[PDB]
Each structure stands twice: as structure tokens, then as C-alpha cells.
């Protein structure tokens, strides 16, 4: 409920624009990012650490035939285990867990990665 307040007050999109430029000074950026996590991502993840740690699994049909080995790769989308979905209602200032863009955002950050790598390797 506090975080929503901040969404009122710092604006996700503003930070999304803050993802881009190098011209943005270092630490301040670090704040905008950490806050971007903080305002949103942090809780889902907070729980998720433990949840993913739990390693509990069901007996859905995939799970009984998930298999594994080549005669090796990690980030497969099968797996499942369990782990609850994180809910996020958007901060709608009208009468918990604030929303953020999903795939858009990963695309952004991944774009930042590529931007990080293509010049970071050149150093």
C-alpha cells in the first residue's frame, strides 16, 4: 500500500525511460533500478526464493514423462514444480501488489544486456 504510493509518485514509465540512457548518472540510476525492483518485483521474488527452493512437484502428465539427459541445457520451460503465481493489481487511485509491464520489460532489460555486452566486450 506504500508501494502504490510510490507508484503515484515516481511512475513506472518514468523509470522505464530511465532504463535507457548512459547519460543518466550512475548512482541515481542505481536507485531507479533498485526501486524498480523494489516497488514491484521484490515481493514476488521474495517469496519466490523460498518457493523455488522447496522443489515440491505434482503428478501432471508432463511430470511423469519429463525425462532429461542428452548423451546438456538448463532453462527449459517444462519443469513446473509448483510455485504460486504472483498476483499484481495495478495502483488504481480510485477508493495490494502493484502491477508492472511484463514481457515489455524483459525485452527492455534484455536489450540493456545486449547493449551491455556489445560494448563491454570491446571495453
Amino acid at each position: 500500500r506504500v508501494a502504490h504510493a510510490l507508484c503515484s509518485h515516481v511512475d513506472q514509465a518514468q523509470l522505464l525511460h530511465a532504463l535507457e540512457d548512459a547519460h543518466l548518472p550512475g548512482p541515481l540510476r542505481a536507485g531507479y533500478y533498485d526501486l524498480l525492483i523494489s516497488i514491484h518485483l521484490e515481493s514476488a521474488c521474495r517469496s519466490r526464493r523460498s518457493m523455488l527452493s522447496e522443489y515440491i512437484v505434482p503428478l501432471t502428465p508432463e511430470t511423469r514423462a519429463i525425462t532429461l539427459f542428452p548423451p546438456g541445457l538448463p532453462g527449459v520451460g517444462v519443469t513446473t514444480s509448483l510455485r504460486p503465481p504472483h498476483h499484481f493489481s495495478p495502483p488504481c487511485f480510485v477508493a495490494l501488489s502493484p502491477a508492472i509491464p511484463l514481457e515489455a520489460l524483459r525485452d527492455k532489460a534484455l536489450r540493456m544486456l545486449g547493449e551491455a555486452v556489445r560494448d563491454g566486450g570491446q571495453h
Binding site: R1, V2, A5, L6, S8, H9, V10, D11, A13, Q14, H17
Partner: protein, 207 residues
């Protein structure tokens, strides 16, 4: 009392380190006091520095500064009001070279045109004006905003600054009066976004 201390001391970063220290314990936190920090801060706006964003603003002028009565025409070829988060800028008004030096990179409370005491301006809903970027809401005779239609037009009497904007042949009521004639006056048309405007001058319409 601590936030109030910060307000007593203006911009001291230390106090803030104090605050974040208040927020959180060894790992746990008192959520309530923090929410009090926010209600005492975030609604209060003014103590902590705060931020947002605009879109780039760009004024346009005819080459000639004025120092008799003059008249000019500004057809609105295009408006794209809501592209990007900002409502599109497109203020129009008179100005002079000392109290208005529009540098796009910020200055003044969130904009560029209409901000100067030396500048005089018009636009948007309810027509009216902006001086000091103050939105005095003098209602139009009827009405409309700025869309790719109106032949907005302006006049200024010599000596007396009896500016009054006109919405496509409909004057926007009584407007400006009594101002310094410190340096030559000139016409202005600020804009934002994907926008076009035509001058029926050299082609007159409404005089």
C-alpha cells in the same frame, strides 16, 4: 519532528540516511512508521525532491520583432494531442527578447512557453492564457481546444498591450492589458509532437 528537522535544514542528506535507518531494523521493519514517513513526505510533496517528465517544447517566431497595431494569421494544419504521456504542447502568444529565452532543456515549473512575465500566451481547452505558466481560465465564447482546424489569430495594438487571441474568427474575450513595452514584441508559436501549422500570410484569411 525529524521530517520537520529536515525541513528546517533544507537539503541535508544525512537526515535521509537517518530516515532510511528509521525505516528498517536489523532486518525486520516497522511498516507503520514508514507509511507515516510517506504520508508525511509523499503527500507533502515539497520537502523531498521530486520528479517527472515532459516532452520537448519548441517555440516558433516570424523573423520580425515589433516596437502601429499589427495582425497575423496562424492556421492549425495538424494536432496530435495525446501521443506520449504528455498532452501535446502548442501554446501561441506574444513575447520579447529578455524575459523569455526558451531553452528546451528544462527551467521553470515543467515547461517552456507561457512561463515568462515578459511573454503572453494562449492554447488548449477553454482557450485562455498562460503568464508565469499560470493557467488563468478565461472561458472562450464557445469553445474547443486546439485541433487541425482553427485559424487562430492574433492582434496587438501599439503602445497598449491589449492582446486578445481569436479562435478562427471568434475572439477570446477580453484578455491582456497594461504591460511594459521593454524591447520589441514578436509573435510566437510553441509546439510539441508531430504537429504542423500554416501561415496564410504570403494568402490572408480573417483580418
Amino acid at each position: 519532528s525529524i521530517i520537520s528537522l529536515l525541513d528546517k535544514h533544507g537539503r541535508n542528506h544525512k537526515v535521509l540516511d537517518v530516515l532510511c535507518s528509521l525505516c528498517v531494523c536489523n532486518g525486520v521493519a516497522v511498516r507503520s512508521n514508514q507509511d507515516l514517513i510517506t504520508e508525511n513526505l509523499l503527500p507533502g510533496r515539497e520537502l523531498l525532491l521530486q520528479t517527472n517528465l515532459i516532452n520537448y517544447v519548441t517555440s516558433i517566431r516570424p523573423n520580425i520583432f515589433v516596437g502601429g497595431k499589427w495582425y497575423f494569421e496562424v492556421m492549425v494544419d495538424e494536432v496530435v494531442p495525446f501521443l506520449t504521456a504528455q498532452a501535446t504542447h502548442l501554446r501561441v502568444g506574444w513575447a520579447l527578447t529578455e524575459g523569455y529565452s526558451p531553452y528546451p532543456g528544462g527551467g521553470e515549473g515543467w515547461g517552456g512557453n507561457g512561463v515568462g512575465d515578459d511573454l503572453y500566451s494562449y492554447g488548449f481547452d477553454g482557450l485562455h492564457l498562460w503568464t508565469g505558466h499560470v493557467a488563468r481560465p478565461v472561458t472562450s465564447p464557445g469553445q474547443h481546444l486546439l485541433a487541425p482546424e482553427d485559424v487562430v489569430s492574433c492582434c496587438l495594438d501599439l503602445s497598449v498591450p491589449s492582446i486578445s487571441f481569436r479562435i478562427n474568427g471568434c475572439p477570446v474575450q477580453g484578455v491582456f492589458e497594461a504591460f511594459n513595452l521593454d524591447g520589441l514584441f514578436f509573435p510566437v508559436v510553441s509546439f510539441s509532437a508531430g504537429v504542423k501549422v500554416r501561415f496564410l500570410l504570403g494568402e490572408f484569411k480573417f483580418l
